């Protein structure tokens, strides 16, 4: 992402800080949520096997 000299943050949907500029070294780094999901258990009948 190209940042103007006077810009600090970024927000695509206007409530999430998508990007940020490091105060020490003036470079621009983007930020992504780590990970998450659901766990599903595929199984046949417990009567059949385990």
């Amino acid at each position: 992402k190209k940042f103007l000299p006077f810009q600090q943050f970024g927000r695509d949907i206007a409530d999430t800080t998508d990007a940020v500029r490091d105060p020490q070294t003036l470079e621009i780094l983007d930020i992504t949520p780590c990970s998450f999901g659901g766990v599903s258990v595929i199984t046949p009948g417990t009567n059949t096997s385990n």
Epitope: K2, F3, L4, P5, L26
Partner: nanobody, 117 residues
Framework: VQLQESGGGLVQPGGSLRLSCVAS???????MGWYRQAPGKQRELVAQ???????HYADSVKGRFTISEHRGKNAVYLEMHSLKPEDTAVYYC?????????????WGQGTQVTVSS
């Protein structure tokens, strides 16, 4: 805020170093300049490169300090050679934003370089 400058350190006389003006974004300008200032002395213009490419050099720094500009990283560079104890100072770089016909440079931050044995 805009521009900040970092790099370099203390080196014994007879060495070399590289000073960098870390990029703070793509800005319009026409003259990237370098001074060094030491306590008890005024801010002396030591180096200056132009948008055209004119490398101004002061008489006490010719042949030892050189300027380059990297458009790929937008950053200015100063390669320093054959250091002397008179070079002990804090170094700052101005830009050439064209305010009101020209002015309001941005050397607000610099790097301390001390040359001593």
């Amino acid at each position: 805020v805009q521009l900040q400058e970092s790099g370099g350190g203390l080196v014994q006389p007879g060495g070399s170093l590289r000073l960098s003006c870390v990029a703070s974004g793509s800005v319009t300008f026409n003259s990237m300049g370098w001074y060094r200032q030491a306590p008890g002395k005024q801010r002396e213009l030591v180096a200056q490169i132009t948008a055209g490419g004119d490398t101004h050099y002061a008489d006490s720094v010719k042949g030892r300090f050189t300027i380059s500009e990297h458009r790929g990283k937008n950053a200015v560079y100063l390669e320093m050679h054959s250091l002397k104890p008179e070079d002990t100072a804090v170094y700052y770089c101005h830009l050439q934003v064209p305010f009101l016909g020209g002015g309001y440079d941005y050397w607000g931050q610099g790097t301390q370089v001390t040359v001593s044995s």
